[PDB]
Amino acid sequence: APKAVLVGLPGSGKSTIGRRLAKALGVGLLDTDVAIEQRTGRSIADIFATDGEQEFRRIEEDVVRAALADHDGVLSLGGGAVTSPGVRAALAGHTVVYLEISAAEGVRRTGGNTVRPLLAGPDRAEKYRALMAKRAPLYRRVATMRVDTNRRNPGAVVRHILSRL
Numbered sequence: 372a373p374k375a376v377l378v379g380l381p382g383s384g385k386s387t388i389g390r391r392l393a394k395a396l397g398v399g400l401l402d403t404d405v406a407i408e409q410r411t412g413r414s415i416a417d418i419f420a421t422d423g424e425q426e427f428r429r430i431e432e433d434v435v436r437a438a439l440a441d442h443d444g445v446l447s448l449g450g451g452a453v454t455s456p457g458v459r460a461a462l463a464g465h466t467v468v469y470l471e472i473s474a475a476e477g478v479r480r481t482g483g484n485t486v487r488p489l490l491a492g493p494d495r496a497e498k499y500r501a502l503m504a505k506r507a508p509l510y511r512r513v514a515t516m517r518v519d520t521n522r523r524n525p526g527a528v529v530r531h532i533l534s535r536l
């Protein structure tokens with residue numbers, strides 16, 4: 372089982388806090404987004420564009436289930452993995468760290484638009500707040516630890532988690 376599974380909105384720090392937390396624990400980071408682009412050989416954008424979200428979500432879920440069983444390090448989920456109920460089910464019993472971020476900050480953290488199909492285009496503030504409205508209940512539902520990352524720097528978020536594992 373992972374030492375911890377990080378979830379939260381795009382730009383909440385999953386990948387960054389993931390890396391740093393893995394380094395601190397001396398374990399591997401598995402980043403499901405990364406695991407998908409390797410498993411498929413495609414970008415996340417290319418999948419969303421050629422295959423659609425439903426098809427991404429299915430590939431994501433399979434990867435997520437395997438990671439949850441096979442990885443003993445830090446597992447960072449794609450930002451919308453929690454929208455799959457099979458994902459949410461496979462999370463039950465795990466150490467799930469919900470990185471919380473305000474919309475204004477999240478908007479700004481994602482502002483060099485990392486790809487992110489679902490944040491792409493203009494009206495990014497609006498889209499980000501709508502992602503938050505829909506997913507926040509889902510993150511809270513799967514979370515065993517909620518960490519506010521709003522005015523905490525990545526090292527402090529890492530320490531807050533480490534101290535609570």
Ligand SMILES: Nc1ncnc2c1ncn2[C@@H]1O[C@H](COP(=O)(O)OP(=O)(O)O)[C@@H](O)[C@H]1O
Pocket residue numbers: 379380381382383384385386387388450480481520523524525528
């Ligand atoms: N606690 C934090 N404080 C400041 N910037 C952060 C923090 N967490 C992440 N970031 C920055 O925000 C950007 C998005 O982080 P990332 O780890 O890619 O988020 P996610 O994996 O959740 O999309 C990165 O440049 C990272 O450097």
Ligand SMILES: O=C(O)C1=C[C@@H](O)[C@H](O)[C@H](O)C1
Pocket residue numbers: 380381404415448449450451452487488489
């Ligand atoms: O639905 C989402 O919020 C996301 C999906 C993909 O772009 C990536 O899996 C990412 O981490 C965000």
Ligand SMILES: [Cl-]
Pocket residue numbers: 380381382385449450451
């Ligand atoms: Cl994300």
